[PDB]
Amino acid sequence: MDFNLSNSQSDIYESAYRFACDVLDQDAQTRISQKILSTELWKKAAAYGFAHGPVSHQFGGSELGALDTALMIEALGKGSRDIGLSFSLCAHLCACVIPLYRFGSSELKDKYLESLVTGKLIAANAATEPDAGSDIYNMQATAQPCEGGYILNGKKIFITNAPIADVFIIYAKTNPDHGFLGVSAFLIEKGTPGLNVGEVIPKDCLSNCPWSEIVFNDIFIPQSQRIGMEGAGGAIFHDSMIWEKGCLSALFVGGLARLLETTLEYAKARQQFGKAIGQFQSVSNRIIDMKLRLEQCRLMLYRACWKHDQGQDAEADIAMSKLLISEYAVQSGLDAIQTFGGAAMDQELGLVRHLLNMIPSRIFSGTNDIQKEIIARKLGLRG
Amino acid sequence: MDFNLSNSQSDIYESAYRFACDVLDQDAQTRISQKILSTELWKKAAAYGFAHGPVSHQFGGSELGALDTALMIEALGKGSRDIGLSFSLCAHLCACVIPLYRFGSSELKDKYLESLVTGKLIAANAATEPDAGSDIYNMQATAQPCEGGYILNGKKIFITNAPIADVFIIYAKTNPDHGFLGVSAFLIEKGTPGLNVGEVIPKDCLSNCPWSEIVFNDIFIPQSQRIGMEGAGGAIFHDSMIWEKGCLSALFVGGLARLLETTLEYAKARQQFGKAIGQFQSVSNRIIDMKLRLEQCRLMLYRACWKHDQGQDAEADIAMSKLLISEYAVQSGLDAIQTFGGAAMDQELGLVRHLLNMIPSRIFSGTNDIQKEIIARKLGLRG
Amino acid sequence: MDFNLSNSQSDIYESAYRFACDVLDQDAQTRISQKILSTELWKKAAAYGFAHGPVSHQFGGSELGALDTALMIEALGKGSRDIGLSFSLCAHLCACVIPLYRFGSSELKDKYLESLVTGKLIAANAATEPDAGSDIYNMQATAQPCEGGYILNGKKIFITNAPIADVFIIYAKTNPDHGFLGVSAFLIEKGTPGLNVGEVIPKDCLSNCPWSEIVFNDIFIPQSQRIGMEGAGGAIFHDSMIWEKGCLSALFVGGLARLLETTLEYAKARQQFGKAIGQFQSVSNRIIDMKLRLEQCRLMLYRACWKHDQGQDAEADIAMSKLLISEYAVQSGLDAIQTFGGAAMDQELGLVRHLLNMIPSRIFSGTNDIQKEIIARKLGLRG
Amino acid sequence: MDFNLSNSQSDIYESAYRFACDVLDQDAQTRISQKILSTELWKKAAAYGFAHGPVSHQFGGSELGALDTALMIEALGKGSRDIGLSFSLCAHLCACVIPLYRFGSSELKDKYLESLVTGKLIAANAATEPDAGSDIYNMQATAQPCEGGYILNGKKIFITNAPIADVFIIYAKTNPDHGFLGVSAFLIEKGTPGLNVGEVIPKDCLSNCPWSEIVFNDIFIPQSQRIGMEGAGGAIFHDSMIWEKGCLSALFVGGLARLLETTLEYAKARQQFGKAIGQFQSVSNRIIDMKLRLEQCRLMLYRACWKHDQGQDAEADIAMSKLLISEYAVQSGLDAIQTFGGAAMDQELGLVRHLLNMIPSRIFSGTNDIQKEIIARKLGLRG
């Protein structure tokens, strides 16, 4: 039992924080106003190390553990206001880089993995369908085995980075008779015949992070582009969602640290009735809730990541962390707005935009109701 | 004890609902997308009756009571998606039309009141200052008595309708030695020398409802433009906020009725895991919370308005209603988004925009912490 | 729309309140300390009118409607501390008197109903079994038709009033192949061969209200003691639970009115740091929550009862009322204890005993999770 | 960063857990039923090590750190149902043993400290007065300096262990002109002339843990019985409350671990509607809340204690831990009762008694509103 960061960990955090503040955050307000995702800036962030995670040196990574990866991303969330860019980068890392590294063949990693790790190629993962969201393993896209590979048909929706991706990590049924066990994973390239990437679909939350639909019309997937074994795609997807839950939770912990600092400063500086508004218990009680949340969920995340690094079973701990972090991110966004009153409406301050950016955290990587189902299953409440 | 609407009340509701659906709601999505407040449409709504409230027939009103006025505005909130336009109209009614009618001299009402009632002139009320929000009676704008009237100096912020108003109902100190008892109210016209109306300041919440700052530099206010008695402006403002709390609460009750209908329909229609998502208790329990909220706060509002119509003391009931309605509007907006999952991000559906539009309800007309202070005082907890 | 009580209603309330304060409450602390249920006092309360409800004059009742019955019981809850005695009386009224009146034959009502209405005979209703609680219609007790009537076998648990009852309203399967449609209802007398009433089983909540198990070993039920039609017992039970939900909710509304008055008085009188503790927002904010709850749930209950009196469908409104009242009763009990601090531990003040008495309200007459299932079904979320 | 216990820590926990299960818990139900605090059993627990904490070997302690002390007490809370006995023991340790060890003179420690450490003498701490609870430093008891020592007059209330104590650690004003800085601490013996210990005052919460009032009528305190320096009693008391907050929080963490295990087992075993009740999301969602609480607050407590052991400032962390643990203990007690339904009323199962035992945790050692004031002050919100 020790709650100090090592010097190595402290350095990883502080280097990422400096990069987020001095490189990504500079000019962020202009990009946010114009709903711009700067792919040149994204590539600098990827190459700096945010697209590396646990990837080995062989492929350009630093062989970071889960806790180190989470610290980097916590720093990113605290230091850069451009949370849409950060979300895009973490989706690429967790849903695309990491499954390719963990399950790809030597051939497939040799062709694509270092390019994803350095951000030379941007990747999108495509699992969700119009009738398969929480019930993801009822997806109906089909990768029908054929001579030389697969014929792919289907439609995927809500695909982060699809309008800017060079490659797609896609999930489809190689055996449509089964659910989880009938899914396989594939890498396909932008521009392959039959791949139709939709136009960006705007949204108010994470508004500069592009997503769209993609449609597959008789795409030929060469055999060598299957990721992992036939029928293992359900497990690959599930594994990538454990990494995703943990890393976006880190982003929102860092965002909550930033929000708390802003909110404390305001509550000390803004006077009404001849005293700082933080002196009224209605005001200070909400700020204390924000502090309690931050301290609790940061510890849950660190323990979940450290257990993983130790080889222990950390999946329930990650589901608990994601459930807490996203709920606390939304609630604390509301509490900050209430602290500021009318001044919260100011687009330059970004407090309403911050709440909008947190609203999808309770949906992404499995909704929080699904996290409860995962925890219930680990607790033995599901048969 | 009776919980049925009279035929008269039912007709008032249904006529307002038809007008909101068939006139205001038609083309609303385009106006909302472009952040347009259509002053021609606003004037049609005002003349239809939304700018009338309790005003007598002498000045073009229908002599509606508080409950009738609330029913009209509940219908407006349920029937039109253009909540920014509705908010603008209700601010004009409650913070400008009603204090002029209730406290204005015969001369001042004869010159201006029917024009406000028919929407020929648009009005903004200006009380809030950079250092006087919740502590509103510490405002520092000064209306220094002089030969012929007053010299007005000061700055007002967060003024709904200021970029489109023809007249301003302004509050300023005629005796800066006192707080509540040193305030007087005045009507001034757009274009009077020394009145500088700021450019619209954008916001994400209620985004097509314009507001800005206004600055007074040595404005001369003629004596006849004081509203009510010298030093009575604190009481006039407070009275107008009771009307405002009740009428915007009605708007958000109607909006919650609309949101609940949309959310129930989706939860019955959207299937995952082979059944409607409403069949999972995590989903249905939130929808039931939305229903419970709607039924409770509608009854609180109706009772508060009816007590007022009966001549009973209704101020605590109105503060309770406003506190409940705005909290429940925000919470139910969050619950609807969680019901829809990824589909909530769709700008055409408007669920995130709905939540944004509800966020200021807990600040406007006195924050909900201030409502608690009002209720605490009525309960005898403030000395 | 009217929120005043009629003179008739006001008189019913005030007469019941006087009886609760001047007759039942006098000496209550001694009975509560000794865990005594005074059957002589219970009979006085029954004869005064608390055992009458909607029963016609023909059988000794006053033909009160649901709202009048609820007002009487609200007064009882506000005026007498002996909530265990009040609960016992209301269980007799709602689960035994009312189904006999509503479904009994002329013969059976002529023999027993006036005696129950005047409290000459005390009744217990017995539906719950060790394996049938929320799933009540899976009860396994069997009333096997035979020449002359039925042979009854089975075991019932959690039976309020069983150690003091003269008659039992019991539910059992006349067709064990079905659930809801296989249940019938019967009246049986204390002392009939094969009826074994268990010894009182102590509890900390409602601690002077006796309950126990009862066992049926080859009881012969004469044909004339069936209540209503063969196979209608599921519907009779369900109907009696609608009356029960509404009347115990009234008791706890009255108890919350009493608790709020006590808590407000203390928060004004108790000083720390040189001021009344109600002046700290942490303290006043909880008291305001208690007030908000009381006003909201009282209105929901009154509307539910009035809709029933009007002939409208009131079952969802009653389920909503019961769910709100019992949750708010428990939460406000907790808030009162927090207001008083160390002084809450005083057995003479009864605040901890009050919380204990409210804890079962969320279980009784169908748990609050089951109320949500009922409301979900009314909302169309259950297929 | 490490979240494993050392072998030493694991052994401390497991030895305390065995002692709580095999010695204290055996026969607990009889003692609880009879409201017995067994002083022979208490002395065995004290001598086993629960009265040692950080005390040095010189005085019979083991020189445990805060985290080790907390682990021992977590084990005690999980392993023994007799929480009243455990509370009594921890009050003796934290409010009496620890301030004597930390501030007593060599002479005073030599005379009394080892006897307290081995439980040969039982101690009560007496700070609270009828008009000084949260405002503790406005206490009015006076220790007026005189030749040879002090003359003590005053009244103390809510004194845990007073009916069974051999010695009293008492706080009184040596300079009544000041608050915090006018308090001194003293040790006095049972039986000294002018000390009147009141009869035990019963309570439903922690019902076998005795407390009473004590009155001082012209007690002579010899000079050598002052604990620490003149005027340092406010600081000694405050320091002892930091130890108390942490150690009773540990007791309630262990109690929550026990409650969760019981509740999970029931939710898997109890069937309704043909499935385990844990399969309904209304049921499993509350159990998941209990799990989330336990994991979060255990980590907060461990970090607070470890920071103290490291020499870092841990007072805010302890206030946060106490606030979380006591709130979560109460809420999870409510959630367990709701899980069990009617079966929660069983006195043998102890679930209602468990909730009663947790209710005072939010009051003791400074109410949770006062904890928020402490945290607000650490956050810079109090001037």
Ligand SMILES: Cc1cc2nc3c(=O)[nH]c(=O)nc-3n(C[C@H](O)[C@H](O)[C@H](O)COP(=O)(O)OP(=O)(O)OC[C@H]3O[C@@H](n4cnc5c(N)ncnc54)[C@H](O)[C@@H]3O)c2cc1C
């Ligand atoms: C910001 C964002 C980025 C995204 N990026 C990607 C991406 O890059 N690639 C990709 O493939 N997908 C992506 N998604 C989609 C995401 O995977 C789905 O939105 C998510 O899994 C939820 O599915 P759904 O939207 O269809 O909601 P539904 O599954 O329809 O859920 C609707 C409601 O039903 C509840 N519900 C459903 N099942 C249950 C159940 N068994 N028990 C209790 N409640 C239940 C849900 O919790 C929710 O409250 C993204 C989503 C978001 C919000």
Ligand SMILES: Cc1cc2nc3c(=O)[nH]c(=O)nc-3n(C[C@H](O)[C@H](O)[C@H](O)COP(=O)(O)OP(=O)(O)OC[C@H]3O[C@@H](n4cnc5c(N)ncnc54)[C@H](O)[C@@H]3O)c2cc1C
């Ligand atoms: C949509 C919108 C439209 C508006 N339109 C108008 C208009 O047309 N005309 C006009 O004059 N103004 C208008 N206002 C301004 C509104 O009156 C103020 O925003 C409101 O009174 C709150 O003041 P403030 O923003 O300065 O917040 P502050 O008063 O600075 O409040 C900051 C925080 O401190 C809390 N706080 C302050 N005092 C206390 C206290 N005693 N006890 C406990 N907590 C306290 C507040 O509740 C809040 O949480 C509008 C505001 C909004 C959001």
Ligand SMILES: Cc1cc2nc3c(=O)[nH]c(=O)nc-3n(C[C@H](O)[C@H](O)[C@H](O)COP(=O)(O)OP(=O)(O)OC[C@H]3O[C@@H](n4cnc5c(N)ncnc54)[C@H](O)[C@@H]3O)c2cc1C
């Ligand atoms: C004070 C008191 C007086 C009583 N008096 C009587 C009396 O006089 N006569 C009589 O016959 N009975 C009486 N009862 C029993 C009462 O009817 C049952 O306790 C009640 O119906 C709950 O059943 P149970 O205790 O078996 O809980 P269970 O049904 O075992 O419930 C355990 C948990 O599972 C939840 N649960 C069960 N099903 C679902 C579901 N489909 N969905 C979601 N959650 C679910 C429950 O809400 C609860 O949280 C009394 C009970 C009490 C507390």
Ligand SMILES: Cc1cc2nc3c(=O)[nH]c(=O)nc-3n(C[C@H](O)[C@H](O)[C@H](O)COP(=O)(O)OP(=O)(O)OC[C@H]3O[C@@H](n4cnc5c(N)ncnc54)[C@H](O)[C@@H]3O)c2cc1C
């Ligand atoms: C189980 C138990 C064991 C105890 N054992 C001992 C013992 O052994 N020795 C001893 O000396 N005392 C003991 N106490 C007393 C304990 O110290 C006091 O009960 C506690 O400090 C609260 O004081 P009070 O009861 O007078 O509540 P009050 O201070 O009257 O509090 C009443 C309410 O006012 C709130 N309040 C007060 N001040 C503020 C404020 N500034 N801001 C916001 N809210 C405020 C409180 O939070 C509470 O909600 C014990 C108490 C308990 C419950």
Ligand code: PRO
């Ligand atoms: O297995 C999981 O973790 C995925 C996430 C979205 C639906 N279920």
Ligand code: PRO
């Ligand atoms: O008196 C009121 O109602 C006003 C509203 C804003 C500040 N206080």
Ligand code: PRO
């Ligand atoms: O139908 C009802 O209302 C009953 C109440 C207990 C179980 N279900």
Ligand code: PRO
């Ligand atoms: O200083 C503290 O920690 C004490 C605890 C009770 C009142 N204040």
Ligand SMILES: [Cl-]
């Ligand atoms: Cl305060």
Ligand SMILES: [Cl-]
């Ligand atoms: Cl469910």
